Amino acid sequence: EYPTVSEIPVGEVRLYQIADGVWSHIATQSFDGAVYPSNGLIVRDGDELLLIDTAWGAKNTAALLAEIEKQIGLPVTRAVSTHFHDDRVGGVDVLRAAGVATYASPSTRRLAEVEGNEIPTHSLEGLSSSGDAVRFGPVELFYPGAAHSTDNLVVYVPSASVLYGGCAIYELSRTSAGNVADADLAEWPTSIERIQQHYPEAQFVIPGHGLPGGLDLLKHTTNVVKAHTNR
Numbered sequence: 001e002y003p004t005v006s007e008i009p010v011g012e013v014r015l016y017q018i019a020d021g022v023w024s025h026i027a028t029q030s031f032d033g034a035v036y037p038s039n040g041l042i043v044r045d046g047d048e049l050l051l052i053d054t055a056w057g058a059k060n061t062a063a064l065l066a067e068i069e070k071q072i073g074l075p076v077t078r079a080v081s082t083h084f085h086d087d088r089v090g091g092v093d094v095l096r097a098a099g100v101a102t103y104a105s106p107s108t109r110r111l112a113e114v115e116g117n118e119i120p121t122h123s124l125e126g127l128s129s130s131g132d133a134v135r136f137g138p139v140e141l142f143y144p145g146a147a148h149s150t151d152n153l154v155v156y157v158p159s160a161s162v163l164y165g166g167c168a169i170y171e172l173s174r175t176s177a178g179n180v181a182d183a184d185l186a187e188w189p190t191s192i193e194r195i196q197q198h199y200p201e202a203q204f205v206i207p208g209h210g211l212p213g214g215l216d217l218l219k220h221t222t223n224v225v226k227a228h229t230n231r
């Protein structure tokens with residue numbers, strides 16, 4: 001069963017196979033007095049691996065690369081960060097030093113610089129406007145519009161029907177809003193609807209934090225976000 005926040009010591013990383021050629025990676029971090037789990041994705045790219053998001057910091061991301069070599073044994077050659085927060089780009093320098101080509105949109109790279117977070121090296125083109133989708137190796141990158149952040153991207157794995165929502169999609173256990181500091185609360189439901197219209201075939205939906213589920217996570221997120229706005 002999927003590892004939970006209490007099952008991962010901070011500094012360790014676990015992998016969970018979702019489908020053939022698709023894993024999530026799961027780490028934990030102490031943040032503002034509490035312990036949170038955090039997910040990213042690993043997607044087989046021929047005889048290489050594509051990474052979606054760091055494991056939230058240099059230590060965790062070094063542990064991620066070690067666990068990938070131990071459990072999978074294919075080299076990570078590219079990585080995409082899905083927004084500019086530390087749980088997505090924290091560890092990009094570890095990746096860069098290990099020879100991983102790190103990617104993000106121009107908006108994510110800009111916002112990371114403003115915030116003082118690590119900056120992915122490469123810029124992704126074609127994701128500037130809501131509804132834009134681009135193929136990137138074995139995934140499709142999709143910009144649904146502003147939500148958890150203005151730059152947030154989602155990732156679809158067509159061979160496996162896996163939708164990676166990142167932090168724009170909440171796990172079912174979360175029934176109140178979390179980090180809204182950089183969010184566009186008003187647009188977030190409309191952006192989630194764009195995802196639902198674009199990836200109706202998704203079987204697995206992976207949130208940025210916590211347990212995977214189905215497409216139900218999309219409505220769930222909309223429910224919680226709207227309830228926060230109306231506080």
Ligand SMILES: C[C@H](CS)C(=O)N[C@@H](C(=O)O)c1ccc(O)cc1
Nearest residue numbers: 031036085087167174178179180209
């Ligand atoms: C440090 C990251 C940057 S996105 C963060 O703030 N994450 C919160 C969020 O994503 O809203 C959060 C995740 C899980 C929870 O249970 C509660 C809050």
Ligand SMILES: [Zn+2]
Nearest residue numbers: 083085167179
């Ligand atoms: Zn975030």
Ligand SMILES: [Zn+2]
Nearest residue numbers: 087167208209
């Ligand atoms: Zn997050």
Ligand SMILES: [Zn+2]
Nearest residue numbers: 172219220223
């Ligand atoms: Zn719900």
